[PDB]
Swiss-Prot record:
UniProt KW keywords: Cell adhesion impairing toxin, Disulfide bond, Hemostasis impairing toxin, Platelet aggregation inhibiting toxin, Secreted, Toxin
Superkingdom: Eukaryota
Effect of residue 43 to A: This mutation alters integrin binding selectivity
Organism (species): Dendroaspis jamesoni kaimosae
Annotated motif Cell attachment site, positions: 43-45
Protein name according to UniProt: Dendroaspin
InterPro entries the record matches: Snake_3FTx, Snake_toxin-like_sf
């Protein structure tokens, strides 16, 4: 599937990745959208970003 791992300062790379789930992380520390193919933490307001099992999965 495709999930981006851009921003911080440098915005061009995207992870055309093989994992069963990917996450949208919109906080970090630096107030930014920097994220990836990983996750696998049930997001029942548990430690982690919001994690989904679809291509992009809402930008």
């Amino acid at each position: 599937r495709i999930c981006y791992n851009h921003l911080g300062t440098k915005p061009p790379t995207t992870e055309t990745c093989q994992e069963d789930s990917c996450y949208k992380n919109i906080w970090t520390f630096d107030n930014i959208i920097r994220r990836g193919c990983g996750c696998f933490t049930p997001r029942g307001d548990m430690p982690g970003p919001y994690c989904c099992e679809s291509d992009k999965c809402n930008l």
